[PDB]
Nucleic acid binder design. Structure first.
Ligand SMILES: [Br-]
Ligand SMILES: [Br-]
Length: 759
DNA sequence: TATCAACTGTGGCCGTGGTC
DNA sequence: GACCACGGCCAC
């Protein structure tokens, strides 16, 4: 199984390293024969002799063109001839590529920004994470001595904890009376012990939670201060800390540093991504948090260190358990994209598509378009019309069906062959024509992207079939994750077409997809209304809710099935309308906000405050309770009594502050905010102190008693102390609970004053 | 100098704090 | 007091 590739330099020449795990053994294979290259399109082939002679310099070394070769490729399906320029060392490419492009006989260069070790994986046909090899994993976490206004890592590491299949231990340099704590004499001895643990255990995967941005940088600074070679790499190298945009990421050579935080962030939507929140949401058990201040107090006084050590043990334990839960899936995604787990687990959606496409482009001799320059990028910022959203007939309805398309946008791309290489391609014998926007697509040959998307969807169906039939539980599970990875990829193509930074950006493709989507969903709505007499209550993009007002449940179902038979005989190709489910009652509040209940009692909620992180739990819980009264018990008066009771509890300071926390994400640098709401006001105050705020940080705050600007009396919940603080009960009534439930009960005539407790 | 210069789409409702 | 831009994060 291939884990990763990189290169090193030996007598000036690049040596590719392929890090493998075959049959329980780590291996390094070396390749010295692979040459970096990129392509040049020339105005005339005789200019190659001038281009051959262009030179550059690299730390006092002269950079030359090693050799050239004229080659035939396809560019958006059409034949083209380019010169493949070869070089001795990958760092020659950035030293010389601009000078070659600037040459007047060079129209443009292509494929000049592909990291060499990834170029190697593609051109060699090599695929990481193939096979059933079992990887050895090890989670770790640290606890540190924090004081507020200090430089990063001015304080020592206090404990290092780790966990694997054998359990969890804690190394520390004070005496703690717990069986899983190993005691050494100093911080230095502790770090060296941990390094020895790693080297002896020899894990393939080091699992952290936010180790990209805290743990490794901390260890590095302490190792600098204490004179420690922190040699975690399997080749003896130290961890490699690199900047990727506004974030950091950390490699450990020969291993996979699997930082769960970016993975969980892509995978699950939670209000906060504390380790405690994540563990509870995935596994369903609490995890107690110990705060930095208590940790420091415990260390400075020697008191209650057992609680700190257990917290530290638990960080490592739950980090290992989460790593076991999330890694196999990220592994199948890496295999599908064809790049390393380290990269793929940190990568954005658009980047995964592009890496997949670059590899398939190589296999098909398709020259890759370049990323846009600053001018082109600014041109691409124009937008287009998206999905159809019908204004709901608002209120409570009974005996509802939801019908929606199977993978609407991918079905469209495939059925109508929507691709930049088919877009208005001249001279064909068959075209499909996108409604409203008018773009024609050639049907005579499969477009590059439709062809790949089609192969993907077909593979996913074969996999689902083999899963059902298989008898091997290991294979079944690998198949499950691969089928899940294909769905993710296949559903990413439409947004990639509209992605300004994409190489295969195609605005005409994207707006053709959405125009076809609008035509299909609105055509289908009109058919079920006109030909079967349904009322369409509400519809968003690819599906709709409908019933027959005065009508039995089995009547609505049967007639929905008849309409489906009728409609799918009219739909072309892969377009297919499906029966998603039957809901006994539904409550439609606005566009994109509604809730339904099924026959078994299960409520499903969309768009309402209940699902959002920027609404306090007390508001969410109460709206949830109002909805159940309506949907389940059809009991409006009980809904009012619930609100009245909740608002009275709040005015009596009987609601625990833990239900008053509001979570809002910082999304940019604090200086760039033009308007400052409460979460930014808090963020700015924390930055004022010793606290780094980066995009993606969730500010979790509570509003304290007062009047005027919310932001002047908001504090991080971390710091809430009921002996020093009084929460703003009128705010949680007037700004949180009542607005959330008024928007629902507005439909039955109740105004805010019918919902408040009376003094 | 040892690596991609950066984090997919549009449609929609809402709270805050500012202006007029 | 009426209005609105900014920014949050949802649905698909
Ligand atoms: Br499915
Ligand atoms: Br409560």
């Amino acid at each position: 199984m291939i884990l990763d590739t990189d290169y090193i330099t030996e007598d000036g020449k690049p040596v590719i390293r392929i890090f493998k795990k075959e049959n329980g053994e780590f291996k390094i294979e070396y390749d010295r024969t692979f040459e970096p290259y990129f392509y040049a399109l020339l105005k005339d082939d005789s200019a190659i002799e001038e281009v051959k002679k262009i030179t550059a310099e690299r730390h006092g070394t002269v950079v030359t063109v090693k050799r050239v070769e004229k080659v035939q490729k396809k560019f958006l399906g059409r034949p083209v001839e380019v010169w493949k320029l070869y070089f001795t060392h990958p760092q020659d490419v950035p030293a010389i590529r601009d000078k070659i492009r600037e040459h007047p006989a060079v129209i443009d260069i292509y494929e000049y920004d592909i990291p060499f070790a990834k170029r190697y994986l593609i051109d060699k046909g090599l695929v990481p994470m193939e096979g059933d090899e079992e990887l050895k994993m090890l989670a770790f976490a640290i606890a540190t001595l924090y004081h507020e206004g200090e430089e990063f890592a001015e304080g020592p590491i206090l404990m290092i904890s780790y966990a694997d299949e054998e359990g969890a231990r804690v190394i520390t340099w004070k005496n703690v009376d717990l069986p899983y704590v190993d005691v050494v004499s100093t911080e230095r001895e502790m770090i060296k012990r941990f390094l020895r643990v790693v080297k002896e255990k020899d894990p393939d995967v080091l699992i952290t939670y936010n180790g990209d941005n805290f743990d490794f940088a901390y260890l590095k600074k302490r190792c600098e201060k204490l004179g420690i070679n922190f040699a975690l790499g399997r080749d003896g190298s130290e961890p490699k800390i690199q900047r990727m945009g506004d974030r950091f990421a950390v490699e450990v050579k020969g291993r996979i540093h699997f930082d769960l935080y970016p993975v969980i962030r892509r995978t699950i939507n939670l209000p906060t991504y504390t380790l405690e929140a994540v563990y509870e949401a995935v596994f369903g058990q609490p995890k107690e948090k110990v705060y930095a201040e208590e940790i420091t107090t415990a260390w400075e006084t020697g008191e209650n260190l057992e609680r700190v050590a257990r917290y530290s043990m638990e960080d490592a334990k739950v980090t290992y358990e989460l790593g076991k839960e999330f890694l196999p899936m990220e592994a199948q995604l890496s295999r599908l994209i064809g790049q390393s787990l380290w990269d793929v687990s940190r990568s954005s959606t658009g980047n995964l598509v592009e890496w997949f496409l670059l590899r398939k482009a190589y296999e098909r001799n398709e020259l890759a378009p370049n990323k846009p320059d600053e001018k082109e990028l600014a041109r691409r910022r124009q937008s287009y019309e998206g999905g159809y959203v019908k204004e709901p007939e608002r209120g409570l309805w009974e005996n509802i069906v939801y019908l929606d398309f199977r993978s609407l946008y991918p079905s469209i791309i495939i059925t109508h062959n929507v691709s930049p290489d088919t877009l208005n391609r001249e001279g064909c014998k068959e075209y499909d024509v996108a409604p409203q926007v008018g773009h024609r697509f050639c049907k005579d040959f499969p477009g590059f992207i439709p062809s790949l998307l089609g192969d993907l969807l077909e593979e996913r169906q074969k996999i689902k079939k083999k899963m059902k039939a298989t008898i091997d539980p290991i294979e079944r599970k690998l198949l499950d994750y691969r089928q899940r990875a294909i769905k993710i990829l296949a559903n990413s193509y439409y947004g990639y077409y509209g992605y300004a930074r994409a190489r295969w950006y195609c605005k005409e493709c994207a707006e053709s997809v959405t125009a076809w989507g609008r035509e299909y969903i609105t055509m289908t709505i009109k058919e079920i209304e006109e030909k079967y007499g349904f009322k369409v209550i509400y519809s968003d993009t690819d599906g709709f809710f409908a019933t027959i007002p005065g009508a039995d449940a089995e009547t609505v179902k049967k007639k929905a099935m008849e309409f489906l038979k009728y409609i799918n005989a009219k739909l072309p190709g892969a377009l297919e309308l499906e029966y998603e489910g039957f809901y006994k009652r539904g409550f439609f509040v606005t566009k994109k906000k509604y809730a339904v209940i099924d026959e078994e009692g299960k409520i499903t909620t969309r768009g309402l405050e209940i699902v959002r992180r920027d609404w306090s739990e007390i508001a969410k819980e109460t709206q949830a309770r109002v909805l159940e009264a309506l949907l389940k018990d059809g009991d409006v008066e009980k809904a009012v009594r619930i609100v009245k009771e909740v608002t009275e509890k709040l005015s009596k300071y009987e609601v625990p502050p833990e239900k008053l926390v509001i979570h809002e994400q910082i999304t940019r640098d604090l200086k760039d905010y033009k308007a400052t709401g409460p979460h930014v006001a808090v963020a700015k105050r924390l930055a004022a102190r010793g606290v780094k705020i980066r995009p993606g940080t969730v500010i979790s705050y509570i509003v304290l008693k007062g009047s005027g600007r919310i932001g002047d009396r908001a504090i991080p919940f971390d710091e809430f102390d009921p002996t020093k603080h009084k929460y703003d009960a009128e705010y949680y009534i007037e700004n949180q609970v009542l607005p959330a439930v008024e928007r629902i009960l507005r439909a039955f005539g109740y105004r805010k004053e019918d919902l408040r407790y009376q003094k």
